[PDB]
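ERR on first pass: missing label on line 2. Operator R.T. fixed the label and resubmitted. Corrected input:
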Amino acid sequence: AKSKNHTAHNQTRKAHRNGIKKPKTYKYPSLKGVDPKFRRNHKHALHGTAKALAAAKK
Amino acid sequence: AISKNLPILKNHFRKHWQERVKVHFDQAGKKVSRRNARATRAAKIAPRP
Amino acid sequence: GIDHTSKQHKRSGHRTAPKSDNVYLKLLVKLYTFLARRTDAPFNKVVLKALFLSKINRPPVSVSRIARALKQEGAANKTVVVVGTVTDDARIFEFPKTTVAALRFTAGARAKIVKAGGECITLDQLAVRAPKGQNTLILRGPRNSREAVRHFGMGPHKGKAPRILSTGRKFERARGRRRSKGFKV
Amino acid sequence: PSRFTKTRKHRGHVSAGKGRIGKHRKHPGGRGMAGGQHHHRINMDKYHPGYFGKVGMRYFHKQQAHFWKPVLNLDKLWTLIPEDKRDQYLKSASKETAPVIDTLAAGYGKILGKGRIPNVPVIVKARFVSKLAEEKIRAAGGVVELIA
Amino acid sequence: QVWGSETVASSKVGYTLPSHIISTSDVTRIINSSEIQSAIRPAGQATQKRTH
Amino acid sequence: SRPQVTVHSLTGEATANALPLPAVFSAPIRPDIVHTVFTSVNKNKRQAYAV
RNA sequence: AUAUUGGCGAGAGACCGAUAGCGAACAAGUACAGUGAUGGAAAGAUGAAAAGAACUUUGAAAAGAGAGUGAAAAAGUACGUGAAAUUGUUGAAAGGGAAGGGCAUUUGAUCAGACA
RNA sequence: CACGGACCAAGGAGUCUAACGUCUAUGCGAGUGUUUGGGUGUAAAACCCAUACGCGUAAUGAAAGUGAACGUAGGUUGGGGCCUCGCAAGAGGUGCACAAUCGACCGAUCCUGAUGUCUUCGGAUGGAUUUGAGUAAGAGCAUAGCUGUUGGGACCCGAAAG
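pass 2 clean. output:
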């Protein structure tokens, strides 16, 4: 006995009961896939800029 | 059979375990017997410790 | 007929009363319901809602966590408010004299505060001292440090503590955990 | 208490919470851990990674008492000292009267350097110590005596 | 002696009498005493007049 | 101090010797926990029955 | 020290209360079935006490009608209490190839309320 | 014009157990669990208790093994509440939990190989688009309840067989 192979019916209605949500963007997004050479230098750039600010309040 | 995330359980109950179930109802009864046995022994083994 | 946009007869989903049957907790709820209604102080509304929280929503606050909060700027004299149980921490050796208010105190925590000259105060005694919350500081325990939180949100490429009874070798470490046996997660 | 169960609330409903199309049967999907590689693979992977296969080397006749080594961090190091005498050693930090702590009697095998200790000379008797646990103890004026 | 007090510990090992989460059992006394009554707004009517 | 409860004789009259409260009567009175403990304690004297 | 659905002698239950509980509360492993191995029931209750109805009358008799016993024969060896299906009699109502139901009222029957 | 139902009475179907997940309540709390056992008793109850043990407080590696503070236990952004100023609006300070991110530390892996060296031992220091179910002022343990899971006859009744 054959059956219904596939249909897109009621799929959009189901998705709108809990309607389409955005991925909730944040400040300072994840640095995944960024150039490792840039991140290697940016790690030492944040280290040095936290030293001058710490030395500005004696 | 496997669904709805849960730790994998290992329950060894695939034999006739219901024929070998030992429930210790006599825990209070045997405790009195041990005290009775200790009491009747000490009278027979006069005053050894 | 009405084309309803939101779900009808939908409850707020927030606790309006404690789930417990503690008679003394209800007295504190009755005391703070009057305060949260007729004082217009935001402190009284936070405490009243915190009294409704469950046991996992009221994590214990170590006495060491109180000392760190009192090391902030201009917070050495602020009355510490903890809606929950204050526990003792032996990892510290110096504790200040600041008063601490909480629902419950353990034997070690209450002795530690009193020995350092501090004072153990129940939440009803703070009402006659700070009706609107003068000079207070609310402290809450960490929620995501619970053991049940580790297994929450488990899935591929998540690293979220698979639920297992026995740990070690031969227990869920071969296929789907390393590149050698097919694939890693 | 059976009077608080959902079976009492299901009296009068035909399917008793099991549905009319599902038709609750004996074992629709198998018994126990059946089909972990055939029709439960989507559940075995995703919430049980690593179940199938072997990784380590076998250990014939393993005795767990051979690997008995409870760890004690530098966090406390003083709950082993009774509370009555703890304060009189803290406010009188000096050598020639250093407290002797035998961590073996307390039930510990190795000392780990996680916490920070006050600057008090402390004599520690332990079977094993971490590398920087010793450094923090020696910096405070104490020594560690290796025992067996 | 059997349950202990603030002087004798418990006569049971590791036991202490339970502590209270509230110092008094009369919530009305706390509300009216001296301090809450000076920090609260004036009361209403205990029944609102039906308007319109 | 303590309420100084009065000691009575076997035959009526209240003897003038008073005793302090043993401080166990100042313990919290929780009808909820005494309820749940009683139901479990009262099940410790049941005999097993089975067909 | 440990085991114990057998045997003997005991003490108990948040157990079951005669389609339940052991198959069996009773002349139960009985009646009965099968060549045989085996299968295997149904069945407890009058009243405090038989005081279990003398006697009269009708009838061949069984029994009926009186009388009598008893606190009660609406307890008579078909016996405590005696439900439903089903049946008889009596009373009421309706009915032109179903009946039954819902809303509303008429008619009949029946019931209720309150006298400052 | 699919199946079950002539009628009535009684009986008749998600139960218990072992091990658990989430949630809730309670007790205590870096601990927690008296009841294997012992003491005791108005005697299967109640009450009292030693020593161990279970789980938790440390992880990580196949293993040998090693083993969590550069620092107000870090920086940045958002943060309830509180504090200061103000008639208020607002402004500043402090900011727990939590959320995002960049670091630090521990183990594993891949490199760098110092003083010392039974000359092959030792592994300091410094790293790495690597990796861990970690650290970063602990939260758990025990009991009970609903729901859910697995093994058990397993909601009740049913095979052709062996």
